[PDB]
């Protein structure tokens, strides 16, 4: 029908929300933003069910149901409402036509990206485009809708009762991150790590052999080493790869009193060429291209809306769809049935955008603008939580994964978020073989919590540091 959320400014929003809150009775006892969650979902039974389950369909069903119950009532109403507010809808959908050119890099390469791995510049273009999208329509209303440029947590506070269960998860995350990083030898990496910290002299006569020796890869090990160190420990190394270079150009060309200036003058080129190449390797490193694949929920959602040919008037039907989808666990099959059968013109188009089977490599690499059935949940949290045609229905509950981020992360409430994630993880573990999955949702949610996300609408790309290097206490 029609969008019952007329908002174009934060004040209007706040009025609408304050109005909505009293008539519905929202709470934030367990959540960072006001919601219907009045009790931490108890997912115990789904475990015993998963244990008792035999066939796979029932296991998937159980998991889906569990996840729904988890996310059913704990959606951040303010931000969710703002996200589907007439204003932001209008501006957000408009923005794509006014900027079709800037995004051609991945936009027009969509059908290719369904199957192929994206190139780094496409990821870059995407992220920048997302940040611009956020800036241009004045999306930021509070912290929960901000873009994080801050820092990953080094200490993650959890209840004792699950610590080992969390540490177990990380151990499986660490394991995975290490397969992305692989395999160039470790001693070389140590050479670099210890080199930059302040022991340059080794460079004259490296212990591995020769400065230019190549391995199975067709190039000097130095480059791969630097690339590796950079992959595992950020861009900063490339700055120290100019500070620590003072001794190179200095001791070789400048210091005419200590070292030669003929057969040594060319040594300056020798390593710096490898540093340059090391940057070139780091840019295209699996770690980075995986890192760049990190998805911006709301932007991708609105992009998919745009691609689906959704207008600010057909949008309520989409919202109603996502709501009804989140309301009660219902499979992909039924989802596709409902997608195709609807009178609405978007459903078929939106269906055509799916790329589940199309993809070949590890899903972690799939460009963040590629829709898949599983990724519908990305839209679900933006539009599905509150059906704009009749927002009062939101009290019924409509679960979508990332709403779990709305849960509190502090000891006062014993971190219901962590408990939930762990629970879902252990359910998945009881039901399936974790090792054999490309991506474990719960692990991802944990990783998102670990970089300090507290709402699904925050952009955590510009966050700095390695989240898996955190300590659980």
């Amino acid at each position: 029908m029609e969008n019952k959320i007329e908002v174009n400014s934060k004040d209007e929003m706040n009025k609408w929300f304050e109005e909505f809150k009293k008539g519905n009775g929202l709470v934030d006892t367990y959540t960072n933003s006001y919601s219907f969650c009045e009790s931490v979902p108890n997912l115990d039974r789904f475990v015993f069910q998963m244990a008792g389950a035999t066939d796979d369909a029932q296991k998937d069903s159980i998991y889906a149901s569990a996840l729904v119950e988890a996310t059913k009532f704990c959606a951040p109403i303010y931000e969710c409402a703002w996200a589907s507010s007439t204003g932001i809808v209008k501006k957000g959908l408009e923005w794509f036509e006014k900027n079709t050119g800037t995004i051609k890099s991945w936009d027009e390469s969509y059908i290719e990206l369904k199957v192929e791995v994206p190139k780094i510049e496409q990821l870059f273009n995407y992220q920048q485009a997302a940040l611009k999208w956020r800036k241009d329509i004045g999306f930021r209303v509070n912290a929960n809708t901000a873009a994080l440029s801050n820092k990953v947590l080094a200490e993650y506070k959890v209840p004792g009762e699950i610590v080992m269960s969390v540490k177990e998860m990380l151990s499986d995350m660490i394991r995975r991150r290490n397969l992305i990083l692989n395999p160039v030898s470790h001693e070389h990496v140590e050479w670099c790590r210890e080199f930059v910290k302040g022991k340059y002299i080794m460079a004259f006569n490296p212990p591995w052999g020769d400065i230019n020796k190549s391995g199975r890869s067709g190039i000097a090990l130095v480059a791969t080493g630097l690339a590796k160190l950079a992959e595992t420990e950020g861009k900063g190394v490339f700055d120290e790869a100019k500070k620590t270079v003072e001794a190179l150009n200095g001791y070789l060309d400048k210091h005419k009193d200590e070292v030669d200036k003929a057969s040594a003058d060319n040594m300056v080129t020798n390593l710096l060429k490898h540093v340059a190449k090391a940057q070139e390797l780091y840019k295209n490193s699996s770690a980075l291209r995986a890192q760049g694949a990190q998805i911006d929920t709301v932007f991708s959602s609105y992009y998919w809306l745009y691609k689906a040919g959704v207008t600010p008037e057909t949008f309520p039907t989409v919202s109603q769809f996502l709501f009804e989808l989140g309301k009660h666990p219902r499979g992909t099959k039924k989802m596709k049935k409902a997608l195709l059968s609807t009178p609405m013109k978007w459903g078929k188009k939106l269906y055509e955008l799916f790329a589940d089977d199309s993809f070949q490599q590890n899903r972690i690499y799939m460009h963040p603008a590629v829709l898949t059935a599983g990724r519908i949940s990305e839209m679900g949290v933006c539009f599905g939580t509150i059906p704009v045609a009749n927002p009062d229905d939101a009290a019924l509950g409509s679960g979508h994964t990332k709403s779990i981020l709305n849960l509190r992360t502090n000891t006062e409430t014993n971190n219901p978020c962590a408990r939930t994630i762990v629970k879902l993880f252990e359910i998945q573990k009881t039901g399936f073989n974790i090792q054999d999955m490309d991506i474990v949702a719960s692990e991802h949610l944990l990783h998102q919590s670990l970089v300090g996300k507290q709402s699904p609408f925050q952009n955590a790309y510009n966050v700095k540091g390695n989240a898996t290097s955190a300590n659980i206490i």
Partner: protein, 90 residues
Amino acid sequence: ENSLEIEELARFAVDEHNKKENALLEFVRVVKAKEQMHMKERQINTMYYLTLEAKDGGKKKLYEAKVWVKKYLGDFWKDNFKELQEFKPV
């Protein structure tokens, strides 16, 4: 319409009580019923107060049941949910 529907809820209620308390009640027939519905566009909430007959081994007994039904007429999925909220003998 309504009379063609209750008996199902009665059988459901008994069948539910059989499980809830591990018994062998056999549904006989319904005698009284009191519906109370609340419709709100898409959202429907109907509460039923039932008075039914059930066999327990042979003798026919009266039972005051109470059932909640929550409905949501959706565009893509019509949702139905029943919940025996209370079941006691008369």
